[PDB]
Amino acid sequence: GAMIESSTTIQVISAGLPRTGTKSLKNALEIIYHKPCYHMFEIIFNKQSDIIKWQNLIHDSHMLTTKTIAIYDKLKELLDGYIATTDLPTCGFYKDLMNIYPNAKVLLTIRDKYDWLHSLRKVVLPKSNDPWKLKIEEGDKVLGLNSDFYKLTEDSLKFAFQKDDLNFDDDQVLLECYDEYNRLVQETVPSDRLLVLRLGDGWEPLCKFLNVEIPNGIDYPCVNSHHQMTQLTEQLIKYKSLDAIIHMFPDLI
Ligand SMILES: Nc1ncnc2c1ncn2[C@@H]1O[C@H](COP(=O)(O)O)[C@@H](OP(=O)(O)O)[C@H]1O
Numbered sequence: 001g002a003m004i005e006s007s008t009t010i011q012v013i014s015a016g017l018p019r020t021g022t023k024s025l026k027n028a029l030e031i032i033y034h035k036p037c038y039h040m041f042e043i044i045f046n047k048q049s050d051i052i053k054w055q056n057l058i059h060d061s062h063m064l065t066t067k068t069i070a071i072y073d074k075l076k077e078l079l080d081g082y083i084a085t086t087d088l089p090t091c092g093f094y095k096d097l098m099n100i101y102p103n104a105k106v107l108l109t110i111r112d113k114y115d116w117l118h119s120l121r122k123v124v125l126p127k128s129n130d131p132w133k134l135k136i137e138e139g140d141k142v143l144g145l146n147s148d149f150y151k152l153t154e155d156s157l158k159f160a161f162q163k164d165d166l167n168f169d170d171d172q173v174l175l176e177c178y179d180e181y182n183r184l185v186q187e188t189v190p191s192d193r194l195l196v197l198r199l200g201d202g203w204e205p206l207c208k209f210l211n212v213e214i215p216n217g218i219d220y221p222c223v224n225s226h227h228q229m230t231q232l233t234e235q236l237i238k239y240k241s242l243d244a245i246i247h248m249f250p251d252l253i
Pocket residue numbers: 017018019020021022023024087115119199200220221222223224225226227
């Protein structure tokens with residue numbers, strides 16, 4: 001097709017929860033648009049200073065009114081220079097992002113609920129008594145992440161699930177929240193403005209939805225498996241720096 005000049009503003013809002021292929025989507029969107037896509041990895045690797053801003057934003061998020069305008073302004077500030085949002089903490093703000101970027105299209109990445117929970121327990125939210133949690137935390141300290149990072153994850157999940165609090169160790173609670181979240185998105189977002197993606201779908205329905213060519217000679221990204229995060233965590237602990245191992249994870253980070 002012809003090359004056209006794309007606007008550097010949020011064009012794609014992905015409501016999918018963590019562990020539903022958000023990092024592959026992030027990579028895919030950056031291949032299509034040639035500008036950055038927001039993701040928790042963007043915070044972790046490029047903008048740790050955003051952590052407190054997202055935390056402040058979620059804090060005020062219970063509140064067009066005037067209180068809303070201040071919040072929408074900070075959302076816009078955080079996302080300046082990006083062409084899309086994925087992953088925590090953005091995903092639970094999909095309703096607001098749709099108001100802020102009226103010309104953006106909405107994606108929902110879904111997958112088998114037990115596969116999701118299993119993946120989540122290995123990476124994002126291990127149980128308190130799970131020994132692997134201590135390894136995750138140790139690898140994370142190497143990246144410069146502390147308890148405020150875990151708090152951001154916790155609070156952005158509560159916010160996505162619209163819960164005042166959440167028993168994070170409770171599998172049933174999380175599964176019910178997962179199903180209701182995905183249901184609510186499809187109920188809320190007008191169908192012409194929404195594409196539901198399943199893992200393995202690849203380029204075609206995404207590119208169709210976005211009116212772009214499928215990228216030539218480039219496979220749809222398949223990164224950020226829990227197996228890969230286990231290897232990353234272990235290598236971080238082993239070498240005690242990111243820059244000593246960064247070359248071993250070329251696409252993932
Ligand atoms: N193209 C693809 N096909 C199948 N699974 C994919 C995929 N891209 C990512 N995934 C899976 O999506 C999960 C990561 O999602 P996220 O980036 O949002 O954390 C991982 O699941 P598993 O941990 O079950 O392997 C990963 O394997």
